Amino acid sequence: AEELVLERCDLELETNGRDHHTADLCREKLVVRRGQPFWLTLHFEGRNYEASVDSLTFSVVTGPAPSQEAGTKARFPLRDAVGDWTATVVDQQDCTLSLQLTTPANAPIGLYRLSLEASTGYQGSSFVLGHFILLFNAWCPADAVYLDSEEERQEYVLTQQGFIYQGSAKFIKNIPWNFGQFEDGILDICLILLDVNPKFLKNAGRDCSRRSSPVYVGRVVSGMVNCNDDQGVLLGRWDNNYGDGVSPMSWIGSVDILRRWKNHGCQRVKYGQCWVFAAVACTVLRCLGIPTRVVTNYNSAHDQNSNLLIEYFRNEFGEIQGDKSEMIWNFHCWVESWMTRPDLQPGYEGWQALDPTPQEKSEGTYCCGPVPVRAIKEGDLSTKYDAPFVFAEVNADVVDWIQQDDGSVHKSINRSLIVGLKISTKSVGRDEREDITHTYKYPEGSSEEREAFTRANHLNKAEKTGMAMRIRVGQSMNMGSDFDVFAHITNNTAEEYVCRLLLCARTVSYNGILGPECGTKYLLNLNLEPFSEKSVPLCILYEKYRDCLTESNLIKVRALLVEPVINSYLLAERDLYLENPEIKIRILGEPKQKRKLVAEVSLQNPLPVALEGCTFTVEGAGLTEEQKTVEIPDPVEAGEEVKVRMDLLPLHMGLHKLVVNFESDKLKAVKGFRNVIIGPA
Amino acid sequence: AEELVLERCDLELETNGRDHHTADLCREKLVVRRGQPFWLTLHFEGRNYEASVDSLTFSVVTGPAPSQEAGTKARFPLRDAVGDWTATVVDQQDCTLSLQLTTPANAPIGLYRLSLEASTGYQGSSFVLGHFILLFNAWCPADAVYLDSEEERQEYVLTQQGFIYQGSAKFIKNIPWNFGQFEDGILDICLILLDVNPKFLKNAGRDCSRRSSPVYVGRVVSGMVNCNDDQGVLLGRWDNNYGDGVSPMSWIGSVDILRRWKNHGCQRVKYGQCWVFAAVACTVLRCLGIPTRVVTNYNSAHDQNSNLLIEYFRNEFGEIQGDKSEMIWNFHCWVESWMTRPDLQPGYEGWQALDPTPQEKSEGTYCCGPVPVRAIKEGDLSTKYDAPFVFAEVNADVVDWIQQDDGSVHKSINRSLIVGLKISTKSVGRDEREDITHTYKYPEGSSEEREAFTRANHLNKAEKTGMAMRIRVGQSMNMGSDFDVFAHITNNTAEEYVCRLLLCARTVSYNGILGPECGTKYLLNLNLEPFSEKSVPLCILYEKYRDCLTESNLIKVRALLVEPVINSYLLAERDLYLENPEIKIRILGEPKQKRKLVAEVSLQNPLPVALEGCTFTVEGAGLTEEQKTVEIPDPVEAGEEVKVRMDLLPLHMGLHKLVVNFESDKLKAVKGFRNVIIGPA
Ligand SMILES: Nc1nc2c(ncn2[C@@H]2O[C@H](COP(=O)(O)OP(=O)(O)O)[C@@H](O)[C@H]2O)c(=O)[nH]1
Ligand SMILES: Nc1nc2c(ncn2[C@@H]2O[C@H](COP(=O)(O)OP(=O)(O)O)[C@@H](O)[C@H]2O)c(=O)[nH]1
Ligand SMILES: [Ca+2]
Ligand SMILES: [Ca+2]
Ligand SMILES: [Ca+2]
Ligand SMILES: [Ca+2]
């Protein structure tokens, strides 16, 4: 009469991980997404259920201080048909009972402890079934992070390899990145990352209860990448002397960054920069289920303190004399996260710009975001989370002053530089770049742009010698060779002029730091004939820039054309990206799941001098569980090619993007990638 | 005593089709590759083998007139260990006997009839086990068509969707093509194609015996595409009036072409052009196992009768007055097949240029090929199969004569046109274009090129006013809008000139046919100031070219600059490709094998006028067994976008390239493609 119910072999079906799009994550722990029912199988050694005999209720607690009011702890009874924490009986057969548990769409994210309390009237018992991790659901309708396009959900959540776009605005290069959010151990690393955040240390219960909202999780996640004081994922150095750590450009996948962080206590890992911060932030948010895409903005006005107007003071040569002034970044990277905003006036649901790179502010040094991109486009700077900084970054106006020899400065015309240019992020389902510049700004000169700027109360700036000049490069220039770049002057006036044109080309880092000039040509008496174009060539030599070039291979050409009669100053500036040698990747053998695959990577040295200490680094999520590195024994000469073969074992079927990086003493951070389609065994 | 051996349920294992890389082809018929052993399972209803009791020999015949000397018929006995037609016993279990049959590497290709003659001493019997198709093996070492790189074998044989590169040399567009060699029924269509060829009609036995060599099969296959008289796959019209048939540019996959051919008796299908001939030839050869890649050559000297020197006579405006003269083709397509050549001096193994497009010759009208590309590069025109024609196509010299008003003609300088330019074919394993121009020609001005030209006994042609002119387009121009193209003159001489510059832009077809001019600007007194560049603009209007534009969207700009003092003629010509509107393709639902998948295709109309009778055609090998076509009910207006949804059921897992074509009255043959990765069920 009324025998105690005893259970054994509780199994949390890994088939529901395919249902929850957490298939890769379901390795020795059950990971599911909120707002969606997940299968649960219970095995007993007696009566299968005996509902008319036994009543049992589930209790789940996630935080260290679980609270029912806070939403971190909830207990629910079992019923045969449907607060939104619901456990229901799908079926009973043999000695096995099959249940379907449902989590609320606003449930907090984190590790959960599942306990069952089965009291059959008299007596009864309580014990823990297991542990599971609840992530944001991009497929669950009414979840804050919901995407209506399945391809969009797949690319912005499930896809582990993508492109980080960098280089120059005129010539954009897609550097491959392996986000690898589902690489082994990363989810626990992200949970540790959240569990050591300042809000949690201050009040763990408040934080764990507040982790339901994607906006809070995004703020914390981006903050944990090299933003706040004490613990962080990365440490930032911009001075181009990364001797004691991994170079910022050397990175090819964020997986090793997180692994380095957790393995060495929780010390900031090596050296990181704006793209690295955005890439690891996107890895964390994608792992946690928040749809996130890394975005690059070219000619970005970073470090200005939310400033719409930047004034540059230049000398007679056009070089900027400011010692306090911060230069326009060649490009800046930040992330965008797809979520709904219930703390703002309705209609701001969508892409939110989270900038994990710390920005200078009067309040202090701290990363901006998340601000709806809609606010930036409409100029609604009153929106809560760091709207003016991002808007100023995209829509800053730059004014170039040239110092006259007599007293005051004179205004020059620079039409070659436009801020917030060629905003780009990887397209959904393709390798092509998607230009999202329209998402942040309206078309220039439109009524809609005018009203949006008026909303920011920023209506300033559009001209007053019928001449123009721009920098032209002709055909492409590869890194490691001397090449010519031309300064093209277009005179469409009856007047014929004698002028002074000053050309200076300087090795420049991606964040605007200018090194010493690698090319200089000054003409004090240049004759511009009427209604004609004149092109003055500047020869840039490999030897002149080799020592002081960045790892971003950026070189800035500046030209200043002065008409003396009317004393008119015309300025043209353009950033060249010296192209690295291509990496030729050959896949050897038939590519199949859990089958040895050989990848042969080779590059042909493009320098006059020999390359020494060459090292190939290869990383892929689904292609190799661990990063593969090969060191080349002997130096590689001027003509010679470096070719090596690395064995990989891919355990995931499907498309994966293998990223390769070659590093040498004279050539650094040359990237390559190859799409690999793994078949079934 | 000595019971008769009776067999039943003979099964030709479809698992060996995965072994033979014929997995897609193994549908209700066994297709295997020569030079490799294929599994065979025999079921009996008595003694499993009783070798000490029964001796049985296999006999296979392929042709209609099988001959042992010819190699079309061969009979071989069964032994337990290894003429190269070998049947051996791998294993015996229960009532089942498992054999492994081996075909010779030089075995002829075609349909084979497998017969077994089992005589157990006294009596015995004979009967047919089944039918199988033997194809070229690119994986079998020592087979003539052998590739050492697995990726190369996969792309040049197994890959069913690729790119046909066309457009202009300066701006190359990759048109997607669905070769679909493994699409249902195509292999039988190709065998019918071979079985109706002239050599077979003349002497079937000789042809079937000669089908062992890939060179013979290639000659016949390329011939059957619109080359020889009577039966052919395609019929060619170049006059741009394809009313009664499918347009040459409308095609997106060669599968429908072959199906149209066989379904309607064997009548030439619709209208075809050089790329169509090459595409169907590549489909046939890839289906038959010969590694083949379609190759495009820009500024190709086709229809010249193997001529290394082409003379053009032009008027005062630079327009070509020749009424007999054939113009330089903007681009020409042909195929390349990988095979060894035993009919030539050793060392010509490799890519063979087969040009299925019929070329004018003194002997008659007939397609060239297969000539080793090595011969073209080395200038060894004595090589057997149409070497001088292809070499002349790539390395022809063009001389432009401008007729003087007084008597004779005067020689002009055209540095804007170089023949055999930007030779390109789809890369192996990627969508990127691979430039194979180096494969046909050595670097200009090198000693190796000089000796190669000397081998062709073609050493002619490199100049004698320090001026130059080229056509510049600035930013891209989309089709359906007016745009400006500039004629850029560079004077680097102390002399200042007054000159006459004549600009004429004419709608041009891809094979050089020039329609009426859509832009004209003539300046009789243009002033070029010293040491300066002058750009003269020509406005090309949509209304001016809409009626007479080709389906290739090609427009040829011609500029003639005449200096009168020294009477120097400078010529610049360039072909623009008006870019079509992009097709935005959205994949809806999770993509899985044998699961309904929705593809939404949409394009935004780029014309001033409305589009009527819009029709979307969608084709994919592995995505749809049959071509899917949707007709848009109402006209699409100037602003509006055309968007439609087509259900597809993909039955093959893996990567497939879905090709889409949109056709309307005002916009024609706009292409798009999307890579689709089909997961398992
Ligand atoms: N500006 C720039 N152009 C590059 C770079 N690398 C290659 N290119 C080539 O430069 C060409 C584009 O130059 P463009 O913007 O048209 O200059 P312009 O036409 O002379 O005014 C392309 O053919 C590119 O392949 C680079 O780092 N910067
Ligand atoms: N020549 C040509 N250029 C095109 C076409 N369509 C787009 N373009 C654009 O033209 C630019 C390249 O022109 P380029 O060869 O550098 O001319 P140039 O620098 O003015 O002498 C690229 O930015 C292309 O995007 C076309 O059909 N023909
Ligand atoms: Ca988007
Ligand atoms: Ca001008
Ligand atoms: Ca090749
Ligand atoms: Ca000049």
Numbering used by the authors:
A (entry chain A), B (entry chain A): 2 to 83, 86 to 464, 466 to 468, 471 to 687
Text from the published report:
To identify the Ca2+ binding sites, a Ca2+-containing crystal of TG2 was produced in totally different crystallization conditions from those used for the previous structural study of TG2. A relatively low-resolution structure of 3.56 Å was solved and refined to Rwork = 22.5% and Rfree = 26.3%. The structure revealed that the asymmetric unit (ASU) cell contained three molecules. The final structural models were constructed with residues 2-687 for chain A, residues 3-687 for chain B, and residues 9-687 for chain C. GDP was detected at the nucleotide binding site in each chain. After careful analysis by comparing the current structure with previous TG2 structures that do not contain Ca2+, we identified two tentative Ca2+ binding sites in the structure of TG2. The first binding site is located in the catalytic domain and is coordinated by the side chains of E437, Y159, and E155. The second binding site is located in the β-barrel 1 domain and is coordinated by the main chains of N497 and F537, and side chains of E539 and N498. Binding of Ca2+ to E437 and E539 induced some structural changes in two loops of TG2, amino acids 406–412 and 460–470. Thus, binding of Ca2+ to E437 and E539 is likely to promote an open active conformation of TG2 by altering the hinge structure. Intriguingly, the present Ca2+ bound TG2 crystal structure is a GDP-bound compact form that binds Ca2+ at only two sites, namely, E437 and E539.
Transglutaminase 2 (TG2) is a calcium-dependent enzyme that regulates many biological processes, including apoptosis, autophagy, inflammation, and extracellular matrix formation. TG2 is regulated by the binding of guanine nucleotides and Ca2+. The transamidation activity of TG2 is inhibited by GTP or GDP binding, which stabilizes its closed structure, thereby obstructing the accessibility of substrates to the active sites. In contrast, Ca2+ acts as a cofactor in the transamidation activity by inducing conformational change to the active open form.
